[PDB]
Amino acid sequence: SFFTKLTAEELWKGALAETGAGARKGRKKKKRKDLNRGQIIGEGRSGFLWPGLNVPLIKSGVVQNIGQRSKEEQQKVEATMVEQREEWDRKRKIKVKRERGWSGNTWGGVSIGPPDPGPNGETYEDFDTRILEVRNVFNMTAKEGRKKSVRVLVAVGNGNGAAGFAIGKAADRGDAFRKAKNRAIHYLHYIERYEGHTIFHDISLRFKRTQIRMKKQPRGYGLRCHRAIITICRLIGIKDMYARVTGSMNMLNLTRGLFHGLARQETHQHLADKKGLHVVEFREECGPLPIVVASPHGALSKEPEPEPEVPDTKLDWQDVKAMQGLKRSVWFNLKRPAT
Amino acid sequence: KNRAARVRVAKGNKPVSYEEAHAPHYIAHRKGWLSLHTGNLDGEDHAAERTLEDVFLRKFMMGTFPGCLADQIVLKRRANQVDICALVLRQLPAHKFYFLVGYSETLLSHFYKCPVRLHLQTVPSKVVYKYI
Amino acid sequence: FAEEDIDRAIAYLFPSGLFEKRARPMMKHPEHIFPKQRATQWGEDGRPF
Amino acid sequence: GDDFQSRILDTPLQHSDFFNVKELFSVKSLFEARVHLGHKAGCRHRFMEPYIFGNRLGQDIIDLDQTALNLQLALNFTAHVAYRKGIILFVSRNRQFSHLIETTAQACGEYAHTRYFKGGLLTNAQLLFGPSVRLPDLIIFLHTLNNVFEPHVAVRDAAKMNIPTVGIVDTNCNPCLITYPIPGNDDSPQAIQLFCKLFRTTINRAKEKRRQMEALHRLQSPK
Amino acid sequence: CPICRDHKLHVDFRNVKLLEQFVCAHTGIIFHAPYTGVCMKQHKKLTQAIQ
RNA sequence: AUAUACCGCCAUCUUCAGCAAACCCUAAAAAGGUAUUAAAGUAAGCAAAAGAAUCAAACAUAAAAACGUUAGGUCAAGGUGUAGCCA
Ligand SMILES: [K+]
Ligand SMILES: [Mg+2]
Ligand SMILES: [Mg+2]
Ligand SMILES: [Mg+2]
Ligand SMILES: [Mg+2]
Ligand SMILES: [Mg+2]
Ligand SMILES: [Mg+2]
Ligand SMILES: [Mg+2]
Ligand SMILES: [Mg+2]
Numbered sequence: 001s002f003f004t005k006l007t008a009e010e011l012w013k014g015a016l017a018e019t020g021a022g023a024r025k026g027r028k029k030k031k032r033k034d035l036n037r038g039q040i041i042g043e044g045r046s047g048f049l050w051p052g053l054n055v056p057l058i059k060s061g062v063v064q065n066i067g068q069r070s071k072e073e074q075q076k077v078e079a080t081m082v083e084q085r086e087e088w089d090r091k092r093k094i095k096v097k098r099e100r101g102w103s104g105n106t107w108g109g110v111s112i113g114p115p116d117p118g119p120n121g122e123t124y125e126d127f128d129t130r131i132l133e134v135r136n137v138f139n140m141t142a143k144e145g146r147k148k149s150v151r152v153l154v155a156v157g158n159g160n161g162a163a164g165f166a167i168g169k170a171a172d173r174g175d176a177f178r179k180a181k182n183r184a185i186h187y188l189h190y191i192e193r194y195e196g197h198t199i200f201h202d203i204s205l206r207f208k209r210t211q212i213r214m215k216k217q218p219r220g221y222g223l224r225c226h227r228a229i230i231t232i233c234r235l236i237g238i239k240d241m242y243a244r245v246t247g248s249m250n251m252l253n254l255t256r257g258l259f260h261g262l263a264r265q266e267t268h269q270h271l272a273d274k275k276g277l278h279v280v281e282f283r284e285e286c287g288p289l290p291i292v293v294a295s296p297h298g299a300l301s302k303e304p305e306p307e308p309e310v311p312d313t314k315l316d317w318q319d320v321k322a323m324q325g326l327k328r329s330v331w332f333n334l335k336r337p338a339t
Numbered sequence: 340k341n342r343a344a345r346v347r348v349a350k351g352n353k354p355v356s357y358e359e360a361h362a363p364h365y366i367a368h369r370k371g372w373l374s375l376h377t378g379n380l381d382g383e384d385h386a387a388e389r390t391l392e393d394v395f396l397r398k399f400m401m402g403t404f405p406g407c408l409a410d411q412i413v414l415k416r417r418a419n420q421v422d423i424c425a426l427v428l429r430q431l432p433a434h435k436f437y438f439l440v441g442y443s444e445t446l447l448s449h450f451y452k453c454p455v456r457l458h459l460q461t462v463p464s465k466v467v468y469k470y471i
Numbered sequence: 472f473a474e475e476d477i478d479r480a481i482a483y484l485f486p487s488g489l490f491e492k493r494a495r496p497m498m499k500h501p502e503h504i505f506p507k508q509r510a511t512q513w514g515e516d517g518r519p520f
Numbered sequence: 521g522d523d524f525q526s527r528i529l530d531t532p533l534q535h536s537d538f539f540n541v542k543e544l545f546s547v548k549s550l551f552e553a554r555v556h557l558g559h560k561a562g563c564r565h566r567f568m569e570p571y572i573f574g575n576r577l578g579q580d581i582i583d584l585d586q587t588a589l590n591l592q593l594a595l596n597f598t599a600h601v602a603y604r605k606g607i608i609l610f611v612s613r614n615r616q617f618s619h620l621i622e623t624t625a626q627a628c629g630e631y632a633h634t635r636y637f638k639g640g641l642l643t644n645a646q647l648l649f650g651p652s653v654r655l656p657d658l659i660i661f662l663h664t665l666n667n668v669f670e671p672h673v674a675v676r677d678a679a680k681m682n683i684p685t686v687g688i689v690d691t692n693c694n695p696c697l698i699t700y701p702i703p704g705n706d707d708s709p710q711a712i713q714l715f716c717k718l719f720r721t722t723i724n725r726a727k728e729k730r731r732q733m734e735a736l737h738r739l740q741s742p743k
Numbered sequence: 744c745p746i747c748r749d750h751k752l753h754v755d756f757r758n759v760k761l762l763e764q765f766v767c768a769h770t771g772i773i774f775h776a777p778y779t780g781v782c783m784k785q786h787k788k789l790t791q792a793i794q
Numbered sequence: 795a796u797a798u799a800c801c802g803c804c805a806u807c808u809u810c811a812g813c814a815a816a817c818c819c820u821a822a823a824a825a826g827g828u829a830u831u832a833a834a835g836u837a838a839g840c841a842a843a844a845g846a847a848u849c850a851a852a853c854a855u856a857a858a859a860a861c862g863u864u865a866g867g868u869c870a871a872g873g874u875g876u877a878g879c880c881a
Contacts (some may be wrong), residue, residue: 003394006801006873007401014801014874021865022799030799030875036406041435052438119646137824143862152824179817220769252822314845335777340859343802348840348860351813364857368846369494371487471840491846517654518607519631615831639827639834644818647837668833677819677834 008035038084047074102227107134107152109231112177116187117157126158130231132165133251134173147171153251154180156188157235164188165232165255191262197239200265204316206256210250213316215242215259223339228254230339236262244318261295268294276301348471356410357468360447374414389416390452400425407431409462421451424458426466436461474500524737528561528730532603538604539725541595544718547584550591553714555704556582558691571703580691587703594686594700595722598658599682602630602726606657609633610719611674613666617712621662624716629725631656633674637666642677660719661687663706664698688715746785754785756792765789 012032013019042054044227047069049055057064101102101109110131115124133153141147150173152215164187168180194200203214214225217240225243229249233241245254268279272294281291285289322328346359361370374393378386393414398410400423409426417460427436440457447455477498485496499503514520526734532538537570549557557571558580573583601608608630612621618634633641638648645653659678666672666688671694678685679697687698688706695701705711746752752761765781767772773793776786 002398004872005398010801011874012801015799017800017875020800021797025865027796027799039405041405041431050438052434057434119651139825149825169823175815212871218769220767256822335775337780338774338778340804340806348814351839352815365846367488368490373487459855469839489846493845512650513654516605517652518605594847613832636830636832637834638836641834641835642816643834644836647817666833667828667831670833673834680819 037088038081043293045074045078047077075243101131107131111229112154112181115182116178124185126160127156127162127185128159128235129154129156129184130235131177132228132231132255134176137169150176152176152180153255154184155232155235155255156181156184157232157237159235159237161193161237162188162190163232163235163259165259167252189259189263191236191238191259192265192267193237194268196237198241199238199262200267203261203265204313205257205261207246207260208250208253209248210253210257211246212254212257212261213244213246213318217241226254229258273298275305277305346471351470353471354465354467355469355471356413356466359470360468373411374416376414376416392421396421396423396447399443399447403439409465419453421447421453421455422458423455424460427461428461429461429463521741524741527665527737529604530652531733532600532729537592537596539596539599539722541599541722541725541728542592544595544705544721545588545591545714547588548588550704550714552711553705554708555587555711555714556584557708557711558582558707563692565692565694567696568689571689571701572691572694578722582691582703582705589706590700591702591704594702594720597684597700598660598686598719598742599726601658602628602723603730605730606649607631608658608660608723610660610662611637611672612661612663613637613672614663614706614712615667617662617709620716621714624720627654629718629727630723637673639673642674642681642683642703655681656683659685661685661698662712662715664689664693664695744782744785746781746789754788754792762789762793763793766793786792 016030016032040054042050047068049064049067051064051066055064099110101107108131111130113127114127117123131152131154133151135151137149137151138146139149149169149171151167151169152173153165153167154177155163155165164184166180166187168176168178168183168194170176170179184250192200197219199214199216201216203212205212219240221240221242223233223238223241225233225241226245229243229245232255233239272279273296276296276299277282278292278296278300279294281293282288283291341362343363345362346353346355358370358373366372375387376389377388377396379384396414397412399410403429404425407427407430409428413424414421415424431439434461440459444457481496484509489495489497556573559705560578561580563574564572564580568580571582571586573581581685598608608628610621610625610630610632612618612634621634622632641648642655645655659674661672661675664672664675669692675685675687675697684699685697687693687695687699687702688704689695689698689701690704690706693706695703702715704715746754754761756762757779773790776783781789
């Protein structure tokens with residue numbers, strides 16, 4: 001009957017079955033389609049031609065009249081529309097490039113773009129955002145039982161010394177990305193780089209149960225660090241460094257501990273001011289030539305810094321063990337792609 | 340819970356028109372009636388026949404102006420005259436509306452044996468009362 | 472012609488029998504219908520008034 | 521043209537005491553107002569011991585020599601900020617002096633917030649006040665503790681926004697986050713009235729100096 | 744690999760600008776094949792051209 | 795055939811007071827965020843409220859009642875996904 005026919009919106013609503021107990025039960029799937037997409041008003045299976053609706057009302061100065069296409073002409077038009085349907089369908093099929101992070105199925109190390117503009121049109125196009133962890137935490141609730149939130153840890157940096165991190169939590173992953181990305185721009189540390197490519201000195205620290213041992217390295221050494229540290233180092237702009245991470249591999253403690261150490265380092269200019277002496281550099285590729293890298297801002301002292309006969313430094317067995325001639329692991333200093 | 344003619348809340352991104360926003364209990368309070376005939380007045384006959392004509396006239400206009408209707412049509416019966424007042428989007432060219440008006444009027448005048456007129460008010464786009 | 476005459480004219484020319492009178496046709500002065508906009512509290516320099 | 525603007529804004533920073541704030545106060549003046557009286561030794565904060573002259577039978581005494589030096593710097597900074605047309609907000613939660621501090625801000629021409637401080641006032645200013653709200657350029661904390669004997673929320677939140685803070689710190693307060701701490705008595709009415717007068721005279725002098733500096737340089741342009 | 748994907752790239756001793764990209768500017772050491780990802784055939788060809 | 799694929803139209807908690815969106819804060823955050831003589835919370839939407847109905851007035855009664863809970867009820871109002879019959 002003509003009176004039991006329902007609209008397209010109501011037909012797809014039921015057939016798709018999105019709303020219902022199935023959705024909460026985690027239940028490829030059918031895809032909605034628009035059936036008026038290619039249909040032209042005035043075009044029918046019979047092939048009639050209606051002047052002023054589906055054909056020109058006047059042609060070459062002649063007022064057109066009603067007509068019908070021949071069986072051959074209509075069959076062409078029907079087949080042509082069938083072709084146009086295939087073209088549109090193919091578009092959806094195409095899958096295009098993205099870049100994987102540390103692994104193909106993980107979000108870690110994936111660039112998600114710059115943070116959003118600021119209040120007064122403050123663009124952050126020079127900043128890049130990287131994901132460091134995506135977690136699906138759960139909170140038990142009486143109404144919903146197990147409820148899921150997406151906890152995302154991201155880092156941002158302009159590759160020129162300024163970087164920051166934040167955590168964003170939401171029920172939807174896309175929202176957690178926005179929250180973390182725009183929150184992290186409010187926590188920008190500035191990290192001091194020696195000559196723009198490395199840290200000023202070795203850095204050893206423990207943050208909670210995570211241990212980090214960074215080492216200053218010469219040019220061309222590259223980044224030889226935890227994949228997360230490589231991600232953050234590129235955001236900061238460090239090009240050559242070594243690092244080792246031990247203890248717990250907690251991603252938040254590693255990021256908090258990394259920024260803690262990198263922000264509390266001491267530039268050569270600072271050291272000259274604290275002690276009042278010149279800071280001189282001796283490279284083995286430049287011979288005995290003394291290189292003065294920082295001179296005290298105020299008054300140069302005349303008391304030589306005390307040089308003990310035997311220093312009381314606390315040495316790490318891991319650093320010393322190598323120089324003692326002990327065999328390293330088979331996994332050490334393997335050939336790896338350029339970082 | 341009552342599910343009748345109620346466009347339910349989403350996350351503030353669902354545009355709804357004035358007609359859609361108001362639930363059935365606001366009929367005769369905040370929103371009026373889409374059809375106005377004398378067949379439901381006391382001591383009057385032919386309610387069933389006026390109601391059946393309305394159902395068809397609404398399905399006819401949806402198909403005859405597919406995707407061009409901004410809101411539900413308003414049917415006004417005076418004497419034997421029928422008047423259809425439809426808000427229509429400006430999607431189709433102007434001359435096409437003149438064709439569909441001439442066609443839909445003549446066809447419905449020879450189907451119900453009454454003078455039927457179509458009144459079209461064109462809107463640039465659907466009017467949104469509120470976002471729910 | 473006054474506000475009282477206007478309300479009477481609109482009620483004749485646009486008869487509405489909706490019970491709630493906020494939902495009826497109205498041709499009122501913009502001051503009555505439009506809520507008073509709170510003025511900006513700071514100047515061009517940005518110093519609150 | 522460009523030279524005149526540079527003269528107005530850059531010349532004031534070439535003099536150690538451009539506004540002559542040194543004359544407003546003296547160690548004797550501070551001692552009259554009981555600015556050297558601190559809380560009992562039990563209430564002492566560890567970060568206040570540098571500023572404490574000693575313990576007179578249980579009551580910590582505040583060195584008025586350090587107070588004079590620090591107060592000179594704080595008043596000097598508050599004047600240059602006022603000279604450059606910056607926004608200054610007075611903040612306190614002591615209800616005995618709520619009306620006096622609001623009256624001072626009105627006299628100076630500046631702003632006062634002596635009421636309950638809403639969480640996010642500075643870290644969420646755009647939402648609370650509007651998209652283009654200009655935040656204070658300096659916050660003067662006549663009292664740095666709230667009424668539960670905890671640091672005023674605006675001390676930490678003003679550092680988060682990188683806003684300098686001139687605060688009166690007593691022997692039980694935490695001066696670590698105050699940019700320009702002024703060690704002194706915060707409870708006595710005579711001490712608070714002295715500080716309120718100093719900040720009001722200082723701000724009015726700086727605003728008057730700006731008008732005179734602009735008139736002189738402006739007049740030179742035609743002349 | 745980087746060399747094979749672009750046919751116009753040619754590993755020749757005269758094409759020094761290409762060869763420079765496969766030598767460390769600071770240490771002057773030829774990068775091992777995993778470093779740039781070139782296949783072993785082209786790495787041997789590059790090493791001979793650089794030499 | 796399957797209400798354990800759904801639409802539609804409802805029941806129950808319920809005349810219960812919450813729900814969800816954008817933010818902000820935490821020596822890290824799985825989550826939490828109130829004190830009025832106020833101590834980190836904020837400002838919009840939905841519900842409640844208000845208003846309308848029972849033809850003065852009030853009160854009362856109706857109506858209204860979000861998000862969810864019960865894979866609650868209904869493939870037999872009608873429609874419909876998948877599977878099935880077509881002498
Ligand atoms: K159902
Ligand atoms: Mg894979
Ligand atoms: Mg005190
Ligand atoms: Mg069910
Ligand atoms: Mg009930
Ligand atoms: Mg009433
Ligand atoms: Mg109600
Ligand atoms: Mg069941
Ligand atoms: Mg059953």
